[PDB]
Nucleic acid binder design. Sequence first.
RNA 1: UACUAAGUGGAAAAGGAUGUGAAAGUGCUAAAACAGCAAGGAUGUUGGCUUAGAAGCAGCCAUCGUUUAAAGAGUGCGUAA
Lengths: 37, 134, 128, 137
Amino acid sequence: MKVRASVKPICKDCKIIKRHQIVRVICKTQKHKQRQG
Amino acid sequence: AGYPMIDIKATLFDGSFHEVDSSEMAFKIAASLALKEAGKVCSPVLLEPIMAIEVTVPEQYFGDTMGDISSRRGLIEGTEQRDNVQVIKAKVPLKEMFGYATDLRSFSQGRGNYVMQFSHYAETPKSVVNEIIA
Amino acid sequence: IAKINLLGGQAKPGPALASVGINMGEFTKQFNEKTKDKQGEMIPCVITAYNDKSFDFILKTTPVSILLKQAAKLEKGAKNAKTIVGKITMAKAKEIAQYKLVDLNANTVEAALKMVLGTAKQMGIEVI
Amino acid sequence: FLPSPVDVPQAKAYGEDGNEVLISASDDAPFVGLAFKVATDPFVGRLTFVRVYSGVLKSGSYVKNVRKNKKERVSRLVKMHAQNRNEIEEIRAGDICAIIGLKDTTTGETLVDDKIDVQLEAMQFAQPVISLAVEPK
RNA sequence: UACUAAGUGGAAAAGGAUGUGAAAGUGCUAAAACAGCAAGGAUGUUGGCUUAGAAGCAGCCAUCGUUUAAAGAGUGCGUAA
């Protein structure tokens, strides 16, 4: 993942979740995984 | 660049007539320079060998060599079977031939080997020919 | 396994019938006699498992859109329906209909004619 | 399990001088000497590694090269062991020797003194294939 | 009483957020849909052009016929085809 400021579901699996109060996207496409949406 | 001008026809068309002289070897040099100027202005095309590959690869990198030749844009209409190897009847350009053995081996442990037969000279593709025209 | 759009004569090219478990030539000799009546345009061939593969080989009907092109006297038309350039004649149309009738899921000759015209719009021919 | 040079199945030699026939390498009177390797040295002369297949290699006189078909004047012969260069004159069949000097020798030539048949070998080796250009300077 | 679990109170921006409860229009099922699965999910067709057989699917398209509960030259994958 990488820190961002706005999550965009650029993949079908991009689930916007919050792990340890960090809002990220979990998805199969590891290219699109980001942080701090 | 001094490349061999082979497989080319030359045609004489016309000369001139005169009574008081206009002798012979003047016509010689005129014809020579005419042929040379025509060769200059011809915008020529070149010939290189694009060789049909008899790819004899053991059946563990058969798919790897298949993909490699597909990246090299070869004509693999099929593959004949053998004891432990498969032989691909493909085509490879001489430009992609430079290091073809080395690259195929670096992608296939070196067991993926090569059998290369010399083919008749064919017209250089548009990319190769235009880099030499001058 | 593998289904191939094989030839009518030799079947040597292709790493799908040479080694699926069976030797090439001993089935090639059958291929020269079981398919000599199925020549012309490239005919489909389907491999299966008898033990792994040695028997139980039959040929599906030819893919009549390039045999349909040859019915238009053509090898390349277009990627879509275009101006009329060929015509599948009476005997050719009827034999293609009866030829597809068993390959298809259909029941009637009219469904076969609809079939032939349905792929006829990829090169630009009308199936009469 | 790796026996004498007579119990081993001898390698075949098709001499290029017109005797391309099946011959043996058993130890016997006739002598054949094949220079299977060479090395360079300015001071002591060229150091050519040879294999003795049959007979004895004479020295101190003119040695015949059948490939060149001429007699060459030699001065000294040698053997480079694992850690020494012993100046020698004769090595029997089944073993390897060398000539210190002999600036005209090829891989496959047959040095003879008893006039044995020819064993010029060139077909058992193959081509380094795949080209890389070299430009002039 | 409606809501919250951020102490939001007791800081906050463009932008972004399948944010909580509740609620306005839009459907079936109540007989048992829908979801996952038991599973059928197919058929000409490797249609051709290029691409080698990229030809269900390197890529394009006519993608229409049909059996039907369903189907697409396939959601796609797998692919040398």
